[PDB]
Amino acid sequence: GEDMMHPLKVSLEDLYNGKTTKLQLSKNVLCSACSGQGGKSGAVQKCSACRGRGVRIMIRQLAPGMVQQMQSVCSDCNGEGEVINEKDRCKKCEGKKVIKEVKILEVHVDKGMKHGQRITFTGEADQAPGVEPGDIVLLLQEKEHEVFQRDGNDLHMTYKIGLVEALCGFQFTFKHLDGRQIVVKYPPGKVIEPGCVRVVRGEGMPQYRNPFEKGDLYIKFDVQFPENNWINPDKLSELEDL
Amino acid sequence: RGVRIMIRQLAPGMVQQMQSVCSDCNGEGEVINEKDRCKKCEGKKVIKEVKILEVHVDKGMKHGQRITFTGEADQAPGVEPGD
Amino acid sequence: GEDMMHPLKVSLEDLYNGKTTKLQLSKNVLCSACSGQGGKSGAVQKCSACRGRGVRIMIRQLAPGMVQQMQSVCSDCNGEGEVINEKDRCKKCEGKKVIKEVKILEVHVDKGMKHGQRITFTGEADQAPGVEPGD
Amino acid sequence: GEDMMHPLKVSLEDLYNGKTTKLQLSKNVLCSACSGQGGKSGAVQKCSACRGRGVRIMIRQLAPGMVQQMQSVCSDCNGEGEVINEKDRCKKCEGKKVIKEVKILEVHVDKGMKHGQRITFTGEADQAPGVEPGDIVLLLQEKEHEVFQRDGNDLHMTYKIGLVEALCGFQFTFKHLDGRQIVVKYPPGKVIEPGCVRVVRGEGMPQYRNPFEKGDLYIKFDVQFPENNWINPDKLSELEDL
Ligand SMILES: [Zn+2]
Ligand SMILES: [Zn+2]
Ligand SMILES: [Zn+2]
Ligand SMILES: [Zn+2]
Ligand SMILES: [Zn+2]
Ligand SMILES: [Zn+2]
């Protein structure tokens, strides 16, 4: 049978911490009451309606002397070309050989898993009579995150700082993907240039299969200048001297 | 026949037969070479002409009163014109 | 369209406290690339294979002088009776007029709800061309 | 005849001020001594060497039993297939019907002309017997300029300023494409943000055919922060208060 592909939307926190989620899927299963045979041997009859074709040709007049032949799925066998009396299949499928069942799959998203990574559930796809079921393949879709951008195992963020912080040193705090508060300290007497990047080592994403190893966090600094007229002209001399 | 049956597919396995007036004889069922009729009608046996009728409305005429111009309607081959 | 019925298994604690749960369902949606038309007007062709029937009659010999005629869904149009070139529909449906999409429904189970109670999501069932979706 | 295309490399100053330049080109002209006839009527003889083919097949042995046939241009008629005795053409062409002459073209580059603009000299290409000459087409190629980048009729430049200049106002001078010194003044109490753009109106490129109208000059400001440790920590408080 055909494999079923489903996108699983995951956050950066889900990918960092790991996540177990329950996915509800509706799939075709072989009808438990007739084991797909549709019905008993000799219960399966040619649909009289479409004469086994699955489809009926309906004639719609558009104008006198203009008829449109439309092919419609046959109402009496729903396209199957066969009819099975309810008593021979069950009061479930309806000569269809399958029933829609709701299955809950438990999905494990491991630490450090990547965008586009596949989680396969073997033989979990749609069942059909005389067909071995395909797989359900979940495709991991990473959601955009407001603070962090992921590059492989590394994380990138933009942090806004004032001119005073950029020149005189600073301390700031942010929330990481595990919910820890990280305190970043930059010593006085070192300058942060506008757009410059600094690194916080080991505060990136965990490696897949090796969650003890992590990438790095790169912080791009956006240096905010003070507004128009922030200082009296008389004090510009004192600033120049410094 | 004057008409052609054109088949329009609506979907694979749904065909609509539409009757269209035949492009080649404009519904007449016959064709006359231009040289045999003229460069006017076109095997049509008639031409559209613009006629000016002078209409006299007499004093005291009533709403719904009829003014008839005899034989002034459309001409057709082998047909005496209406009014 | 037909309504889709799904059993939602709930515990007594879920029914007592109330519960919000996310249900992932796969449904047929109209193909965004051809708006169900399947393809452009005149892109829809009769399947040559089954001559518009959706099905092919395959002859299986059981023994010399015993042939079984089996009706199989036509491989070339997957039962539709029509074929649409990929370029006329998209590289998605495949002349099918629909695509399987995964939708997440947020389901609210209120306090005191009963066994057999129905929660309806209107128009959320399978879409088909020229058919208003069921619930 | 075929048109001759020549790239003319022009600077922004050339395009702003206008430029007259002399271009020396070598072209084929009809031989003044035989008027292309090659020679007198009956002076033109089939080349005996190549029997009128212009080419000779030379056999080079590569190994015994391996011969390479190479087609070479015929030495005796230089590919023409004909030979004209020197006395019948002149001591110039040599039965060639043309001579290489050096022509100087005066090229006018007007104010506001654009990259890729064509200057055509009609009938100035190579002459051949019984062929009307093609044109010489000069294609203007704008050279990169160290300070200014041109966009249509507008000019762009990057100007570096200190943090003090960005906050307290500044005055600077630059040399324009006409060689004028432009003094740009920015008033005190207005801030220049890093990477912000300002405009000096009417200091762009002149419009082609309308050199009284000019585009604008856009100045991107690159704000230079002071280096690491530029101020004593004790003075950081005084800076914060301002
Ligand atoms: Zn069944
Ligand atoms: Zn049927
Ligand atoms: Zn489609
Ligand atoms: Zn088919
Ligand atoms: Zn000569
Ligand atoms: Zn020769």
XYZ file of C-alpha atoms and ligand atoms in Angstrom:
708
model
C 0.000 0.000 0.000
C 0.833 3.694 -0.294
C 2.815 5.428 2.484
C 1.032 8.274 4.337
C 3.049 11.466 4.919
C 2.049 13.775 7.800
C 3.760 17.075 8.805
C 4.442 17.272 12.550
C 4.914 20.888 13.676
C 7.481 21.032 16.536
C 8.883 24.042 18.463
C 12.589 24.665 19.281
C 11.768 23.850 22.950
C 10.229 20.514 21.818
C 13.442 19.749 19.837
C 15.733 20.856 22.718
C 13.974 19.110 25.641
C 12.446 16.187 23.724
C 8.680 15.644 23.482
C 6.208 12.789 23.600
C 2.977 13.654 21.748
C -0.157 11.684 20.820
C -1.199 11.929 17.170
C -4.746 10.925 16.284
C -5.073 9.622 12.695
C -8.071 8.204 10.822
C -7.139 5.209 8.639
C -8.852 2.451 6.673
C -8.704 -0.936 8.408
C -9.955 -4.292 7.121
C -13.578 -4.751 8.209
C -13.384 -6.957 11.350
C -16.827 -8.494 10.530
C -15.963 -9.826 7.012
C -12.099 -9.744 7.073
C -12.057 -7.603 3.866
C -13.635 -10.411 1.845
C -16.286 -7.780 1.609
C -18.760 -10.554 2.157
C -19.020 -14.360 2.218
C -17.868 -16.234 -0.929
C -20.692 -15.510 -3.420
C -21.883 -12.453 -1.442
C -20.005 -10.231 -3.904
C -22.325 -9.269 -6.785
C -21.736 -7.088 -9.869
C -23.350 -3.703 -9.329
C -26.505 -3.772 -11.578
C -26.519 0.055 -11.706
C -23.122 0.565 -13.394
C -22.763 -3.081 -14.634
C -19.439 -3.396 -12.743
C -17.993 -0.101 -14.137
C -18.047 1.840 -10.803
C -19.326 4.860 -12.807
C -22.610 5.953 -14.408
C -22.943 8.244 -17.418
C -25.514 10.944 -16.599
C -26.889 13.050 -19.446
C -27.440 16.744 -18.608
C -29.223 18.865 -21.255
C -27.551 22.301 -21.620
C -29.892 23.380 -24.449
C -32.275 21.473 -26.848
C -29.839 19.599 -29.117
C -26.919 20.103 -26.666
C -26.517 17.197 -24.193
C -23.551 16.899 -21.813
C -22.524 13.383 -20.811
C -21.052 13.577 -17.320
C -19.399 10.525 -15.716
C -20.493 10.323 -12.079
C -19.398 7.791 -9.461
C -22.150 5.158 -9.249
C -24.442 5.930 -6.263
C -25.311 2.233 -5.801
C -21.747 0.875 -5.311
C -19.896 4.147 -4.466
C -17.395 3.433 -7.280
C -16.465 -0.155 -6.294
C -18.386 -1.802 -9.197
C -19.558 -4.445 -6.711
C -22.395 -4.656 -4.183
C -22.392 -6.762 -1.006
C -25.660 -7.178 0.923
C -25.298 -5.720 4.451
C -26.005 -9.169 6.002
C -22.963 -10.652 4.169
C -20.388 -7.988 5.209
C -21.841 -6.380 8.356
C -23.721 -3.210 9.338
C -20.273 -1.520 9.327
C -18.275 -1.271 6.029
C -21.308 -1.792 3.681
C -19.715 -4.048 1.053
C -16.695 -1.734 1.187
C -14.251 -4.329 2.708
C -12.757 -1.546 4.912
C -13.879 0.701 7.802
C -12.492 4.052 8.973
C -10.873 3.594 12.393
C -9.307 6.239 14.616
C -5.800 5.258 15.771
C -3.685 7.133 18.330
C 0.059 6.981 17.617
C 2.519 7.865 20.377
C 5.235 9.994 18.755
C 8.633 10.457 20.401
C 10.604 13.532 19.322
C 14.169 13.032 20.565
C 16.527 15.806 21.694
C 18.457 17.421 18.837
C 16.203 16.107 16.031
C 16.408 18.225 12.853
C 13.953 19.943 10.537
C 12.792 17.501 7.816
C 13.683 14.411 9.912
C 11.340 11.424 9.372
C 9.622 9.318 12.069
C 8.288 6.094 10.497
C 5.473 3.880 11.821
C 5.783 0.633 9.831
C 2.588 -0.955 8.405
C 0.452 1.773 10.035
C -1.011 3.219 6.780
C -4.336 2.338 5.104
C -5.239 -1.352 4.808
C -6.778 -2.770 1.617
C -7.870 -6.384 0.770
C -4.896 -8.352 -0.620
C -2.514 -5.378 -0.042
C 0.213 -5.171 2.641
C -0.188 -1.759 4.434
C 2.235 1.102 3.771
C 3.946 3.178 6.486
C 2.944 6.366 8.285
C 5.856 8.811 7.874
C 5.838 11.892 10.089
C 7.929 14.759 8.717
C 9.265 17.103 11.419
C 8.473 20.752 10.652
C 10.376 23.189 12.864
C 8.302 26.216 13.870
C 9.784 29.695 13.758
C 10.870 30.865 17.223
C 10.575 34.509 18.344
C 14.031 34.868 20.013
C 16.238 32.062 18.609
C 17.098 31.031 15.057
C 18.585 27.560 14.658
C 21.580 26.791 12.433
C 22.347 23.051 12.651
C 23.343 22.579 16.321
C 23.982 26.311 16.932
C 21.522 29.005 18.010
C 21.446 32.640 16.877
C 19.757 35.570 18.617
C 19.701 39.365 18.289
C 20.104 41.311 21.544
C 19.501 45.075 21.804
C 21.847 47.089 24.070
C 22.248 50.831 24.775
C 25.354 52.860 23.802
C 26.352 53.032 27.515
C 26.143 49.202 27.797
C 28.166 48.824 24.555
C 30.997 51.110 25.866
C 30.979 50.537 29.665
C 30.046 46.808 29.919
C 26.726 45.185 30.843
C 24.828 42.274 32.354
C 21.645 40.806 30.890
C 19.405 37.773 31.391
C 17.364 35.662 28.966
C 15.238 32.500 29.104
C 16.746 29.477 27.311
C 14.876 26.614 25.526
C 15.022 24.486 28.749
C 13.499 27.390 30.736
C 16.754 28.157 32.638
C 17.621 31.835 33.153
C 21.073 32.527 31.665
C 23.026 35.527 32.999
C 25.433 36.921 30.381
C 28.135 39.282 31.686
C 30.354 41.497 29.543
C 33.296 43.121 31.421
C 33.762 46.936 31.655
C 36.408 48.442 29.358
C 35.593 46.155 26.393
C 33.559 47.621 23.504
C 30.678 45.974 21.639
C 30.613 47.265 18.046
C 27.193 47.635 16.273
C 26.268 44.325 14.621
C 29.173 42.424 16.264
C 28.699 38.756 17.231
C 29.709 37.091 20.523
C 29.449 33.442 21.574
C 28.069 31.699 24.667
C 29.699 28.261 24.421
C 27.611 25.083 24.952
C 24.260 26.989 24.959
C 23.189 25.829 21.449
C 20.970 22.860 20.447
C 21.780 19.291 21.670
C 23.222 16.887 19.096
C 20.828 14.161 17.897
C 21.721 10.802 19.595
C 24.410 12.614 21.672
C 22.388 15.122 23.816
C 25.365 15.704 26.175
C 27.080 17.588 23.330
C 25.575 20.947 22.369
C 26.325 23.626 19.814
C 26.942 27.282 20.700
C 24.736 30.382 21.103
C 25.714 33.304 18.838
C 24.459 36.711 19.996
C 24.352 39.556 17.464
C 24.392 42.912 19.282
C 22.138 45.713 18.039
C 23.533 48.929 19.583
C 20.828 51.545 20.216
C 22.031 55.138 19.995
C 20.270 57.757 22.197
C 17.618 59.915 20.526
C 17.875 63.418 19.027
C 18.716 66.163 21.612
C 19.475 63.629 24.442
C 22.267 65.846 25.860
C 22.638 69.633 26.328
C 25.252 71.073 23.833
C 27.207 72.517 26.824
C 28.086 68.909 27.887
C 29.351 67.810 24.432
C 32.837 69.153 25.368
C 32.966 66.935 28.518
C 31.983 63.915 26.340
C 34.666 64.720 23.711
C 37.370 64.894 26.449
C 36.437 61.351 27.616
C -28.504 19.495 -40.918
C -27.677 23.210 -40.281
C -26.220 22.104 -36.901
C -23.061 20.363 -35.663
C -22.805 18.259 -32.514
C -19.721 19.409 -30.576
C -18.421 17.220 -27.757
C -17.152 19.151 -24.708
C -15.397 17.130 -21.970
C -16.506 18.271 -18.476
C -14.377 15.607 -16.737
C -12.721 12.300 -17.917
C -15.743 10.028 -18.458
C -18.169 13.008 -18.587
C -18.729 14.327 -22.146
C -21.354 16.971 -22.972
C -22.817 16.898 -26.476
C -23.730 20.468 -27.384
C -25.632 21.249 -30.609
C -24.092 24.346 -32.191
C -25.211 26.148 -35.347
C -22.918 24.979 -38.162
C -20.142 27.576 -38.724
C -19.820 26.632 -42.416
C -23.453 27.303 -43.484
C -24.619 29.498 -40.540
C -27.567 27.118 -39.962
C -28.917 27.029 -43.550
C -27.706 23.444 -44.269
C -26.640 24.665 -47.720
C -23.553 26.413 -49.096
C -23.459 28.665 -52.171
C -20.069 29.717 -53.576
C -19.706 33.531 -53.418
C -19.357 33.705 -57.246
C -22.818 32.076 -57.666
C -24.767 34.389 -55.284
C -22.657 37.565 -55.042
C -20.176 39.172 -52.630
C -23.275 40.349 -50.695
C -25.641 37.744 -49.100
C -23.080 34.841 -49.078
C -25.359 31.957 -50.090
C -27.922 33.396 -47.670
C -30.520 34.399 -50.365
C -31.235 37.628 -48.391
C -29.385 40.839 -47.432
C -30.043 43.272 -44.572
C -31.237 46.589 -46.022
C -32.037 49.802 -44.170
C -35.468 51.192 -45.114
C -36.885 54.564 -44.038
C -40.667 54.538 -43.536
C -42.548 57.838 -43.421
C -45.081 57.527 -40.590
C -48.101 59.830 -40.380
C -49.682 60.200 -36.936
C -53.075 61.847 -37.468
C -54.779 64.232 -35.032
C -56.800 62.468 -32.333
C -55.193 59.022 -32.810
C -55.487 56.805 -29.708
C -53.134 54.768 -27.553
C -52.762 51.234 -28.998
C -53.839 52.332 -32.515
C -52.106 50.417 -35.350
C -50.396 51.914 -38.434
C -49.824 49.157 -41.025
C -47.247 49.145 -43.843
C -48.347 46.296 -46.139
C -45.675 43.867 -47.453
C -42.925 45.877 -45.706
C -41.704 43.064 -43.378
C -38.820 40.617 -43.965
C -38.569 38.972 -47.393
C -37.725 35.270 -47.759
C -37.357 33.102 -50.943
C -40.772 31.717 -51.978
C -42.538 33.657 -49.155
C -44.806 36.707 -49.613
C -43.631 39.414 -47.103
C -45.635 40.180 -43.957
C -46.600 43.689 -42.793
C -20.540 15.544 1.815
C -20.597 12.691 4.323
C -20.109 13.414 8.047
C -17.017 11.864 9.708
C -17.562 10.180 13.094
C -14.588 9.827 15.477
C -14.622 8.237 18.982
C -12.888 10.418 21.585
C -11.821 8.363 24.619
C -12.091 10.512 27.797
C -11.403 9.611 31.467
C -13.666 10.458 34.459
C -11.025 13.039 35.540
C -11.205 14.624 32.041
C -15.040 14.812 32.369
C -14.876 16.157 35.965
C -12.145 18.811 35.531
C -12.715 19.620 31.847
C -10.049 19.030 29.186
C -8.667 20.759 26.123
C -7.073 18.256 23.713
C -5.608 18.516 20.198
C -6.914 15.968 17.698
C -4.889 15.421 14.540
C -7.034 14.276 11.579
C -6.114 13.600 7.947
C -8.765 14.882 5.514
C -9.180 15.491 1.790
C -8.988 19.175 0.845
C -9.487 20.751 -2.585
C -6.123 20.903 -4.371
C -4.883 24.499 -3.815
C -3.022 24.423 -7.194
C -6.059 23.605 -9.429
C -9.008 24.471 -7.086
C -10.485 20.943 -7.580
C -11.052 21.584 -11.284
C -8.572 18.785 -11.414
C -6.915 20.691 -14.195
C -7.491 23.627 -16.564
C -10.651 23.511 -18.741
C -9.785 20.832 -21.345
C -7.031 19.338 -19.138
C -9.473 16.604 -18.092
C -9.168 13.640 -20.486
C -10.991 10.282 -20.565
C -8.697 7.586 -19.211
C -7.600 5.599 -22.353
C -6.852 2.540 -20.177
C -10.381 1.953 -18.818
C -12.173 4.155 -21.444
C -13.693 6.273 -18.627
C -14.943 3.229 -16.612
C -12.506 3.643 -13.650
C -12.061 -0.173 -13.733
C -10.242 -2.720 -15.911
C -11.305 -6.329 -16.420
C -8.234 -8.543 -15.921
C -8.394 -12.165 -17.056
C -6.634 -14.636 -14.724
C -6.310 -18.252 -15.940
C -7.048 -20.742 -13.111
C -6.609 -23.762 -15.422
C -6.628 -24.218 -19.277
C -10.303 -23.651 -20.145
C -11.000 -21.914 -16.788
C -10.546 -18.107 -16.957
C -11.503 -15.781 -14.087
C -12.504 -12.237 -15.015
C -11.517 -9.998 -12.114
C -12.518 -6.308 -12.052
C -9.552 -4.280 -10.805
C -9.390 -0.530 -10.195
C -7.691 1.012 -13.242
C -3.974 1.619 -12.474
C -3.813 4.566 -14.907
C -6.575 6.736 -13.342
C -6.809 5.107 -9.859
C -10.574 4.602 -10.372
C -11.477 8.188 -11.393
C -12.063 7.337 -15.103
C -10.240 10.573 -15.969
C -6.585 11.556 -16.360
C -5.157 15.051 -15.838
C -1.565 15.751 -16.926
C 0.554 16.758 -13.895
C 1.286 20.185 -15.484
C -2.482 20.970 -15.597
C -3.296 20.101 -11.937
C 0.040 20.350 -10.092
C 2.759 18.023 -8.775
C 0.434 17.496 -5.765
C -3.017 15.840 -6.277
C -2.162 14.174 -9.665
C -5.438 14.762 -11.524
C -7.212 13.739 -8.315
C -8.765 17.211 -7.574
C -8.031 16.677 -3.830
C -4.970 16.361 -1.554
C -4.646 14.746 1.884
C -3.982 17.469 4.468
C -3.321 17.063 8.181
C -5.577 19.302 10.300
C -5.309 19.817 14.068
C -8.676 20.379 15.773
C -8.760 21.867 19.269
C -11.378 19.888 21.208
C -12.944 21.270 24.387
C -14.458 18.701 26.755
C -16.596 20.643 29.240
C -17.170 19.681 32.883
C -20.020 17.207 33.375
C -20.211 16.076 29.719
C -21.802 12.620 29.317
C -20.906 9.365 27.606
C -22.134 9.414 23.972
C -22.237 13.250 23.839
C -21.377 14.719 20.402
C -18.893 17.537 19.656
C -19.472 18.824 16.100
C -16.971 20.673 13.884
C -19.082 22.115 11.045
C -17.783 21.785 7.445
C -14.577 20.116 8.709
C -15.055 16.757 6.889
C -13.644 15.705 3.492
C -13.899 18.201 0.623
C -14.890 17.089 -2.890
C -15.313 19.162 -6.130
C -18.866 20.569 -6.320
C -19.743 19.129 -2.854
C -20.236 21.159 0.356
C -18.145 19.455 3.136
C -19.815 17.401 5.872
C -19.094 17.759 9.608
C 29.147 44.691 -43.979
C 29.334 43.602 -40.342
C 29.051 46.208 -37.553
C 32.106 46.611 -35.269
C 31.425 46.798 -31.514
C 33.997 48.518 -29.260
C 33.769 48.981 -25.444
C 34.554 52.555 -24.368
C 35.556 52.691 -20.687
C 34.324 55.987 -19.134
C 34.608 57.293 -15.533
C 31.775 58.889 -13.481
C 33.577 62.263 -13.885
C 33.601 61.744 -17.695
C 29.818 61.027 -17.578
C 29.113 63.991 -15.236
C 31.222 66.686 -16.960
C 31.075 65.335 -20.525
C 34.191 64.227 -22.425
C 35.625 64.457 -25.913
C 38.083 61.611 -26.601
C 39.987 60.435 -29.694
C 39.677 56.731 -30.492
C 42.248 55.236 -32.846
C 40.898 52.220 -34.789
C 42.500 50.071 -37.493
C 40.043 49.174 -40.277
C 40.091 47.677 -43.765
C 39.617 50.271 -46.514
C 39.327 49.694 -50.265
C 42.814 49.812 -51.799
C 43.141 53.372 -53.212
C 45.475 52.094 -56.007
C 43.072 49.482 -57.520
C 39.677 50.590 -56.042
C 39.099 47.054 -54.618
C 38.990 45.550 -58.108
C 42.010 43.853 -56.694
C 43.623 44.446 -60.033
C 42.796 45.494 -63.607
C 40.114 43.450 -65.443
C 41.934 40.163 -66.210
C 44.572 40.796 -63.504
C 42.655 38.441 -61.198
C 43.956 34.877 -61.651
C 42.944 31.600 -59.965
C 45.540 30.688 -57.358
C 47.502 27.751 -58.954
C 48.561 26.545 -55.478
C 45.078 25.820 -54.065
C 43.269 25.820 -57.483
C 40.916 28.582 -56.236
C 40.066 26.780 -52.932
C 41.881 29.264 -50.604
C 43.146 26.209 -48.649
C 45.782 23.497 -49.132
C 45.552 19.998 -47.678
C 48.926 19.177 -46.091
C 49.670 15.571 -45.154
C 51.623 15.211 -41.884
C 52.871 11.707 -40.975
C 52.350 11.009 -37.237
C 53.701 7.441 -37.505
C 54.319 5.042 -40.491
C 50.770 4.120 -41.554
C 49.251 7.100 -39.656
C 48.859 10.237 -41.830
C 47.073 13.398 -40.641
C 45.460 15.530 -43.349
C 45.551 19.106 -42.079
C 43.784 21.912 -43.981
C 46.026 24.984 -43.959
C 45.272 28.413 -45.422
C 47.033 28.585 -48.800
C 50.369 30.455 -48.416
C 50.254 31.682 -52.038
C 46.884 33.528 -51.896
C 46.479 33.891 -48.081
C 43.035 32.223 -48.300
C 41.541 34.405 -51.080
C 41.725 31.673 -53.787
C 42.913 34.369 -56.205
C 46.277 35.953 -57.009
C 46.802 39.461 -58.402
C 50.277 40.442 -59.640
C 51.630 43.374 -57.569
C 51.830 45.580 -60.718
C 48.048 45.153 -61.294
C 46.886 46.075 -57.743
C 49.761 48.106 -56.252
C 52.686 47.591 -53.858
C 50.093 48.063 -51.065
C 47.208 45.524 -50.678
C 48.922 42.673 -52.659
C 45.926 41.336 -54.600
C 43.941 41.656 -51.368
C 41.572 44.459 -52.609
C 41.810 46.114 -49.139
C 44.477 47.823 -46.988
C 44.605 48.328 -43.213
C 44.251 52.046 -42.450
C 44.394 53.775 -39.076
C 41.403 56.084 -38.507
C 40.957 58.483 -35.577
C 37.323 58.903 -34.491
C 36.367 61.868 -32.312
C 33.974 60.525 -29.665
C 31.666 62.847 -27.729
C 30.400 61.533 -24.387
C 27.524 63.802 -23.341
C 26.610 64.700 -19.751
C 24.335 62.151 -18.073
C 24.977 59.324 -20.579
C 24.269 55.860 -19.119
C 26.116 52.569 -18.834
C 25.495 50.442 -21.966
C 24.566 53.489 -24.106
C 25.614 53.197 -27.783
C 27.502 55.793 -29.866
C 27.216 54.889 -33.573
C 29.566 55.956 -36.389
C 27.659 55.134 -39.595
C 29.549 53.393 -42.451
C 32.805 53.527 -40.441
C 33.362 49.724 -40.214
C 35.478 47.516 -42.512
C 35.132 48.041 -46.271
C 34.961 45.089 -48.681
C 34.610 45.045 -52.535
C 30.913 45.165 -53.512
C 29.835 45.494 -49.826
C 28.420 48.647 -48.176
C 30.381 49.208 -44.882
C 28.799 48.457 -41.501
C 28.827 50.833 -38.509
C 31.270 51.305 -35.640
C 29.221 51.039 -32.421
C 30.901 52.199 -29.220
C 29.368 50.707 -26.075
C 29.804 52.898 -22.976
C 31.272 50.940 -20.055
C 31.050 52.807 -16.751
C 34.109 52.299 -14.546
C 33.722 51.625 -10.844
C 34.333 54.771 -8.779
C 36.031 54.693 -5.353
C 33.645 57.077 -3.485
C 30.383 57.185 -5.501
C 28.067 54.446 -6.749
C 25.617 55.479 -9.464
C 21.942 54.477 -9.473
C 20.271 55.944 -12.585
C 20.552 59.725 -12.020
C 21.259 59.407 -8.265
C 24.598 58.957 -6.495
C 25.296 56.869 -3.389
C 28.250 57.174 -1.014
C 29.262 55.783 2.386
C 30.611 58.333 4.882
C 32.310 57.343 8.158
C 31.596 59.502 11.243
C 32.552 59.203 14.939
C 30.016 58.592 17.753
C 30.493 62.230 18.913
C 29.690 63.513 15.378
C 26.632 61.197 15.200
C 25.224 62.538 18.545
C 26.424 66.185 18.671
C 26.285 67.214 14.962
C 29.109 67.607 12.436
C 30.507 69.295 9.344
C 32.407 67.486 6.597
C 33.719 68.184 3.097
C 34.075 65.990 0.006
C 35.124 66.424 -3.636
C 32.284 66.047 -6.171
C 32.506 64.702 -9.779
C 32.915 68.306 -11.116
C 35.802 68.888 -8.661
C 33.797 71.319 -6.453
C 34.249 70.991 -2.682
C 30.841 70.379 -1.060
C 30.423 71.295 2.624
C 27.746 69.159 4.316
C 26.476 70.437 7.682
C 24.368 68.455 10.141
C 22.875 70.532 13.018
C 23.630 69.801 16.721
C 20.891 67.991 18.662
C 19.914 65.688 15.758
C 21.113 62.058 15.864
C 22.550 60.016 12.991
C 21.701 56.333 13.526
C 24.222 53.656 12.323
C 23.522 52.820 8.670
C 20.975 55.666 8.260
C 20.700 57.462 4.897
C 20.494 61.237 4.306
C 20.057 63.159 1.051
C 21.887 66.113 -0.506
C 19.373 67.311 -3.112
C 20.523 68.122 -6.685
C 24.051 66.665 -6.148
C 23.431 63.473 -8.207
C 24.211 62.782 -11.903
C 22.909 65.139 -14.667
C 20.030 63.852 -16.799
C 20.967 62.864 -20.370
C 19.821 65.622 -22.829
C 18.672 67.754 -19.836
C 21.943 68.459 -17.893
C 20.289 71.284 -15.881
C 18.290 68.605 -14.026
C 20.246 66.357 -11.659
C 19.432 63.459 -9.378
C 20.233 63.408 -5.652
C 23.221 62.294 -3.535
C 22.377 59.656 -0.898
C 24.875 59.414 1.970
C 24.883 56.253 4.100
C 26.444 56.985 7.505
C 28.808 54.429 9.041
C 29.026 55.325 12.760
C 32.403 54.420 14.290
C 32.267 53.537 17.981
C 35.365 54.315 20.126
C 37.726 51.420 20.861
C 37.922 49.127 23.909
C 38.883 50.951 27.176
C 38.525 54.480 25.620
C 37.167 55.927 28.904
C 38.075 55.372 32.589
C 35.271 53.389 34.413
C 34.995 56.259 36.970
C 33.567 58.509 34.174
C 30.908 55.999 33.004
C 28.506 57.406 35.665
C 28.871 60.978 34.263
C 28.126 59.598 30.748
C 25.037 57.673 31.973
C 23.635 60.862 33.618
C 23.874 62.718 30.260
Zn -16.770 -5.680 5.880
Zn -22.185 0.805 -9.549
Zn -5.218 19.531 -8.083
Zn -8.770 4.220 -15.992
Zn 44.561 47.047 -54.205
Zn 45.713 29.538 -52.847
